[PDB]
Design a protein around this ligand. Sequence first.
Ligand code: SF4
Ligand code: SF4
Ligand code: FES
Ligand SMILES: [Cl-]
Ligand SMILES: [Cl-]
Ligand SMILES: [Cl-]
Ligand SMILES: [Cl-]
Ligand SMILES: [Fe+3]
Ligand SMILES: [Fe+3]
Ligand SMILES: [Mg+2]
Ligand SMILES: [Mg+2]
Ligand SMILES: [Mg+2]
Lengths: 626, 626
Amino acid sequence: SKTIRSRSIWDDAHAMLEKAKAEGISTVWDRAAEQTPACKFCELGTTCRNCIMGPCRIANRKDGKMRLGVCGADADVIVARNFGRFIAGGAAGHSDHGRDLIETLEAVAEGKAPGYTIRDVAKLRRIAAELGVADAATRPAHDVAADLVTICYNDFGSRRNALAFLARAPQVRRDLWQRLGMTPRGVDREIAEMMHRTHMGCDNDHTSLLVHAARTALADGWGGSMIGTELSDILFGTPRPRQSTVNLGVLRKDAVNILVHGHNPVVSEMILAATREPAVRQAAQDAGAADINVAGLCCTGNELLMRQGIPMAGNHLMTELAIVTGAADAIVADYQCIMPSLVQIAACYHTRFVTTSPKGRFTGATHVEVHPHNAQERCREIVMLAIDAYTRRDPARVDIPSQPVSIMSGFSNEAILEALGGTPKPLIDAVVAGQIRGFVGIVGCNNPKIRQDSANVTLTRELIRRDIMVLATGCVTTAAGKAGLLVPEAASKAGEGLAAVCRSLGVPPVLHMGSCVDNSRILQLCALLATTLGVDISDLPVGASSPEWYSEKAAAIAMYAVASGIPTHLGLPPNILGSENVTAMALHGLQDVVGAAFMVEPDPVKAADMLEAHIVARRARLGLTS
Amino acid sequence: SKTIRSRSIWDDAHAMLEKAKAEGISTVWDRAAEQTPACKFCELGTTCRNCIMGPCRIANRKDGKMRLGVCGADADVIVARNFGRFIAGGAAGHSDHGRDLIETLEAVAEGKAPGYTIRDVAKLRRIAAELGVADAATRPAHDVAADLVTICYNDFGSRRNALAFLARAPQVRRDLWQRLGMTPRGVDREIAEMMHRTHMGCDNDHTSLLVHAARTALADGWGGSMIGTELSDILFGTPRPRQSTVNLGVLRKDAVNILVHGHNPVVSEMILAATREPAVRQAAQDAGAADINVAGLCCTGNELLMRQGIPMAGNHLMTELAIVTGAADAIVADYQCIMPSLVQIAACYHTRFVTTSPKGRFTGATHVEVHPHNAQERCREIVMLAIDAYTRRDPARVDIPSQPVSIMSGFSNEAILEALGGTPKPLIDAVVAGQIRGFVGIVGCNNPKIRQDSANVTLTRELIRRDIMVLATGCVTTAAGKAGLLVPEAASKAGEGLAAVCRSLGVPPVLHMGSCVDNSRILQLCALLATTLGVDISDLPVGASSPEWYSEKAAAIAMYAVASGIPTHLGLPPNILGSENVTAMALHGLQDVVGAAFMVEPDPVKAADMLEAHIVARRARLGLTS
Ligand code: SF4
Ligand code: SF4
Ligand code: FES
Ligand SMILES: [Cl-]
Ligand SMILES: [Cl-]
Ligand SMILES: [Cl-]
Ligand SMILES: [Cl-]
Ligand SMILES: [Fe+3]
Ligand SMILES: [Fe+3]
Ligand SMILES: [Mg+2]
Ligand SMILES: [Mg+2]
Ligand SMILES: [Mg+2]
């Protein structure tokens, strides 16, 4: 229908929306329509439920009533506190993610994690040395891992003046954060401090609240997320370029299909390993299947793509539709971004919905809890449940639409530097020559308010045509992949300068740099280029964009990008427009404080113009043309 | 006047409400009226703003529209997540408070805190030995302090299996918490995990969410709060019984009046010291003042009262009225429960409003930031500001409405045990013999929804009449004090059994045990009684009540009491009634899980009946026949 066509740009999404219609299954778009119009105070941010003197709403009434909350707080404070707690929730998602990796590395170092290993010993020794572990180059690997675990845990404590990985940022940027009171000190400490500041009668100054929101977000980007990324590479391997495929057509009628969903590779890597064990494969063959087929959703999907080349079935708004194919024999979830509607949709089929984390509980799910000491045994058990469920698939309701689209994944910073010959000199040369005018990270989600992937795809296409290389993470990965942008032959979609550089290196014009925690790789790349050139991150020809964001996590990434000096575009506004002062600080005031600001623009072509304009202005201050 | 009499039971409040109305000053009661009726969804908890797929509201309609959020979350999940973040904000308040005490003790141990010292060396050595410091009885005090600092900081890290002070709880309770997954592990860690669990698509099971809310609150009561109480006693002295006074009449027309407000004695103790320096007093005399008079508000007032006998001007809803006397020359604020309306009310007079914490910023305040290394110099500057403001005081606008009333304060557990002769045996014997039926801690706030202190005082009177001894903390202290119940002669208002015990010890029937963090003293006392008798806390004839609560901190206290086995009454419901399942768990289901539950009851006589009924049942669980 016209409604279905308006919900997504993709053929596979349309086919499943028609099928969900015929089967009477409601989707995220139907619930979004039920929640429109939204509450006007909630959307503006001018409501507070932080104590039971309230709840309070701030209105503009002719009688002048409801200008203040019961405690006396005005719209500036109420909006800034709501936004601070919103950012803290996003930082906490990445923080707990990093913490789980520390605990997994510790279990490996203690010999208490069967099936887990140090997959990248060289990176372990390099990271440990960088952070100050003595004799990291020569001591037994597990001893070095134990000392690296201690350093990472200290960043989740309360005794540091600055996070360990902050040393990567250029000195000028660290000096600025120190003057501003933005230096992140402890990953959990800043989240806790934000929750204290936002209690009634604590922080009642919108500027101070926004400064701490920046500090809390920096504790994610340079702490929780960066620890998460670097330890994931140590446990599961540093990504290198590899071929794979994307879209609902990666599911196979002839195989047992297991979709992995959520964020943490500690689970999805062990599910993949279980499906490769000979006795498990034989059980699938006895059931009538040709093979076992693992396919990724969302960030845990990105993790398996980066390190194992596992095909990705879809991003956020495809998740329900992947079930509607009728071919999902099990969905294995850990935590974050897993819509609870998936439990009810899975119950419309034979599909098993399996939870694995004590943090990600879903009423009605089959819970098989996974920890380092038992993952090998439990993941074997979960794959066996998938195989059993396959025997009851209803073949009449199977509709796998579309043929999969080829992609190239695996662009860690290590992989980029290797393609360049071991130094950033050829990339710097390309930027100085104007062949590559700048870089934009396009990150984040889908949102049913925006036709799915329409802005993600349009923005990526516009930027590469203007010789701006795109670094893609998170759910943008699937959009760029389905648009044919993630392969070396996509150099033909870029402008003449970027196409030539890509062809000379053999890489695509859009580089998949990983999951949402892997936005930390973009910070590390920026820091390296700034330190190499002797400038600040706020001087580099860079930008960031989340055209279709929805999550608290995406807002935390955008805040840490801005506070690190990267101009950051959002397709939709956070719930802050009820305060002109908070809004003006996010869109304009921060520009002169931290060197960058937020932009809000729902037209992806106009967003391309704004990101390009910031890049051009930064090129001028480096003394470059174009 | 009938409206004014409806707002408070107290003459001093009545007098200042009349003065405020005559002067056009808006109070918390006026703003509460403007915010009534409240938003129905906010009040019920059936609204969510945790992502920009929303905001979402949940209705209960026969057609089933707006039954779910855009992500699919139902009322049970939305309500439980909202209550979880509510609890996390309260735990965070106490956590940051405890953290600041660690940092101050560290500064003393390093020799970098002029004017601070270890005031109670004997308690330092006992606490350090209790928590495992080697040779705590003989090593240099600064070495012992440094080792205790390290233990406390490790509780603010991510490597423990259980908080250090949790060892005080009886083994049976520790075993239950461990099996339930409720054991608190790290003070900041549990807060961060709550914020992770409540992100879209993480924890989507209301039972799981409430269990982690209990774990988060327990990390406060046995962690942040207990650390704060024990280190405050080490740095500033263990409280011992002493007489003082209460009400607005503690302000003096002929003196420079400095009100300390907020929570942290690290500031208020140094303000007090500054007012005693000879040169500062000479400056006050040069201005025409007879004295410099410090008086307390809210929790920091409680702290100075407990350790220094400093008179208390009022509790939460008295704070605006204290400025309306016209005699407040400065308000010196740190953080928490400081209504921002105080800045505007101060600007109606000569009063200086001074902020001292980087966490407690108020737009328009005079900021003089205080840290251990500079407090001596900065507090002197703050007192000079107050003296200058005194020279600007308009005598025509002064109305100090009452004469103060005597109270006894200082009942730390050390003081109680000393009064009992060194052991708890005389108290246990009185309970066994039925002279004291049980104990109730009455804790927490005021709330403009309830006539001020009406339920606090009526519940206190009802309980002592039934031979139930009351332990009072927080803003209830001022209520019981103004009612005349904090003195030994108030035994005449108790039942025959309690009166006889009180008279035999020379103590009041209502024992002031300190500020809100000092509810940790009640946990310690319950744990000692249960350990001595060989039972659980959930077997003791104890209860807790906050008849007039408002804050996230009060909800966290109630939750940690319930989770520790103490039945807890609340005068008003949290914003949870939109979920019958969450409400039933809070009020009934938790009884099976943790051995105690919440009660919600606005009639304080009925609340007394309910607390007494739990006490009767616990006496039967102990086999008592008296
Ligand atoms: S913190 Fe202030 S604005 Fe928020 S609900 Fe409480 S009284 Fe209202
Ligand atoms: S988390 Fe779910 S219920 Fe909450 S605002 Fe987002 S879509 Fe709505
Ligand atoms: S639902 Fe209560 S203000 Fe939006
Ligand atoms: Cl800058
Ligand atoms: Cl810029
Ligand atoms: Cl008296
Ligand atoms: Cl029990
Ligand atoms: Fe994501
Ligand atoms: Fe309090
Ligand atoms: Mg500062
Ligand atoms: Mg400038
Ligand atoms: Mg600039």
